[PDB]
Structure 1
Amino acid sequence: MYVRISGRIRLNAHSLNAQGGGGTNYIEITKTKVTVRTENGWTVVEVPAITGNMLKHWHFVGFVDYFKTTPYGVNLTERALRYNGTRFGQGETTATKANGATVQLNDEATIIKELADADVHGFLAPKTGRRRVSLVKASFILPTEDFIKEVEGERLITAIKHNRVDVDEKGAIGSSKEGTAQMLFSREYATGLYGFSIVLDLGLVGIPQGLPVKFEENQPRPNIVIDPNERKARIESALKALIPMLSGYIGANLARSFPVFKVEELVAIASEGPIPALVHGFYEDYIEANRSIIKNARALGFNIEVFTYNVDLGEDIEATKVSSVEELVANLVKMV
């Protein structure tokens, strides 16, 4: 199955996904340039953003956090349990198993069988030259067009400063001859009505790309190199990873930021068969496009069930009125 999520999400007072600034106390936030129609004349505005790479990283974190609860969490890499994005990065010709075992980098099917990270997010092994695309694909998080139109662009940057305090058993701070250890850093603080949209191409979970299908009597069928309940648990964990992406675990310095996280409205499509990508929330006329897509995809023989949150979506397209995301996970996993 390839479930797609999209919609409009509000992030207020978030310091998520900074840029570091290149070695400056004033920490730069992720600024991305976007285009707005702006009636007669188009405009280009540079606005704070959350990159899809870090969104994928946080989806990985959620998946590996919800995968340890399953009894089949041994296949999960212990480096994933500590939220590590590294995978065969530099000279890593072997892999470390959660139970202290060494896994070779040959027979990609065995790699994805013994590593849940390989199955869900792909891998890159430069030493052995092993390639596997990430099944989860995250889009960029940008403020939607009507937001810029109504706020006339704005800045969405406040730049609150933060410092340190030291007593060093002396009651003072100290000069540079002792270390100071008191740093003044000002981190950009942003907001806006953003758009969340990540696709979970989960139909390849447990299916290596080397030999995706087999033909014993000349029919196409997925190559499931693992036993079925392991694949079902992996699918369940991947779907559950959607839950923190909307309750809110994403964003940089989550310990000090934890932005108030909710989606203003949401659309989800299960779509067991391959389908077009669901449009990410940035626009104004996407309601019509989504309505047409859903109302005419069933004419192509696609048994897509649509879950709708805070969108009317007319009255003739059938949909499931929802108000959370774990209910979405439950109704997605009760059929698979």
Structure 2
Amino acid sequence: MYVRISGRIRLNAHSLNAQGGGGTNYIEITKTKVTVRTENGWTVVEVPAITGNMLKHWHFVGFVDYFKTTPYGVNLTERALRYNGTRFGQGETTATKANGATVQLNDEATIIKELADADVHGFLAPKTGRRRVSLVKASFILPTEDFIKEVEGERLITAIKHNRVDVDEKGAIGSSKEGTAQMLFSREYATGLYGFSIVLDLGLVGIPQGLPVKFEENQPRPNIVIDPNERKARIESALKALIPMLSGYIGANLARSFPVFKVEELVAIASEGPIPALVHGFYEDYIEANRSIIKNARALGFNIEVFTYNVDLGEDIEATKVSSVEELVANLVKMV
């Protein structure tokens, strides 16, 4: 299930992935510089963004959330139950499962056998030296070129300032000498139309990276250490993890912001073998750049199957017109 999805989402009134501010009264949304042609010379502009680390962590949260319900959910790290983003500490040698057992950090085959999140998202053990490349890779969330260019200014960010009120048992505001724990706590709020190009090389799940393929008699075979039903359950959980990603469960400050979210359009390709990475939706003509990347891909011998939402993608290309996100996940998991 080497599944690649990319699309445009209308993120309105969000505050995801601030800059922390060190705990002062002003905290700002992280910003990055992107290049736009503007038809009169390429220029770089600084705009708010969502770092891929946040998206990957929220994917991990969705994965564990939808993997707990599965009866094969015992094989989860203890730190993973509390949605702790860490995978392995700098100097720790053992890991704790949900039931409280102890897992060694050598011969990563058993590590991915007895742990679910470390199997699908990768890990790193500095002491023993074990490592595993993440099977889920996510890209930045940037405002699109056609939108970033036609605004012609329009700083977007508004910096709403909202402060805490504190009253003691006598109903007194207090002063700085008494503290009263009062801060103004100004926060930046952005908007715009963004793109996402997360990918999932889930076909390698449950397979040690040291010996990905075993040879019985001069013939390849996948090295599925875990039970095939466990592999199917892990794949189903990973696919369903996208459901609380395109619904408004990404970023931070969810308790106060919870971005007004809607997916404007998207295209996804599942296939079975290694396939080209789908281009990001940030560019304006990506649809065309996709119409020429899947129509001819099928000619080379790739069994690409494409689902599209609010994108024409021509007519000669056999594209399934998905109407929402979760039924896209249903179509994806039909082929397990």
How do residues 41-60 of structure 1 correspond to structure 2 at under 5 angstroms? 41-60=41-60
- The answer on 1:23 being equivalent to 2:23 is yes
CA distance in 2 between partners of 1:153 and 1:292 (Å): 33
Offset of residue 151 of structure 1: 0.4
Maintained 8 Å contact 1:12/1:259? yes
CA distance in 1 between partners of 2:243 and 2:66 (Å): 10
After superposition, what is the alpha-carbon deviation per residue over 1:210-254, rounded to whole angstroms, capped at 9, x for unaligned? 110001111222110000000000000000011111011101111
Maintained 8 Å contact 2:291/2:313? yes
CA distance in 2 between partners of 1:260 and 1:197 (Å): 20
Find the residue that maps to 2:170 and give its secondary structure.
coil
CA distance in 1 between partners of 2:81 and 2:254 (Å): 18
After superposition, what is the alpha-carbon deviation per residue over 1:46-80, rounded to whole angstroms, capped at 9, x for unaligned? 00000001100000001111111101100122321
* CA distance 1:151–1:313, shift in 2 (3 Å): same
Offset of residue 177 of structure 1: 2.8
CA distance in 2 between partners of 1:206 and 1:138 (Å): 20
The 10-residue stretch of structure 1 (170-179 or 80-89) with the greater mean CA deviation from structure 2: 170-179
Maintained 8 Å contact 1:148/1:154? no
Offset of residue 323 of structure 1: 1.4
CA distance in 1 between partners of 2:197 and 2:262 (Å): 14
Offset of residue 334 of structure 1: 1.5
Identity in percent:
100
Q: Aligned residue pairs: how many?
A: 336
The 10-residue stretch of structure 1 (150-159 or 304-313) with the greater mean CA deviation from structure 2: 150-159
Alignment-derived partner of residue 174 in structure 1: 174
CA distance in 2 between partners of 1:53 and 1:167 (Å): 38
CA distance in 1 between partners of 2:167 and 2:45 (Å): 45
Unaligned runs of 5+ in 2: none
Offset of residue 23 of structure 1: 4.3
Maintained 8 Å contact 1:45/1:153? no
Maintained 8 Å contact 1:196/1:281? yes
Offset of residue 40 of structure 1: 1.7
The 10-residue stretch of structure 1 (127-136 or 84-93) with the greater mean CA deviation from structure 2: 84-93
CA distance in 2 between partners of 1:241 and 1:95 (Å): 24
After superposition, what is the alpha-carbon deviation per residue over 1:66-101, rounded to whole angstroms, capped at 9, x for unaligned? 111101100122321211111112322110010011
After superposition, what is the alpha-carbon deviation per residue over 1:296-315, rounded to whole angstroms, capped at 9, x for unaligned? 11111111110000011111
Maintained 8 Å contact 1:144/1:282? yes
After superposition, what is the alpha-carbon deviation per residue over 1:4-60, rounded to whole angstroms, capped at 9, x for unaligned? 110111100000000112443110211010000101221110000000011000000
- Indicate the RMSD between aligned Cα atoms, in angstroms: 1.0
TM-score (norm 1): 0.98
Maintained 8 Å contact 2:196/2:282? no
Maintained 8 Å contact 2:3/2:270? yes
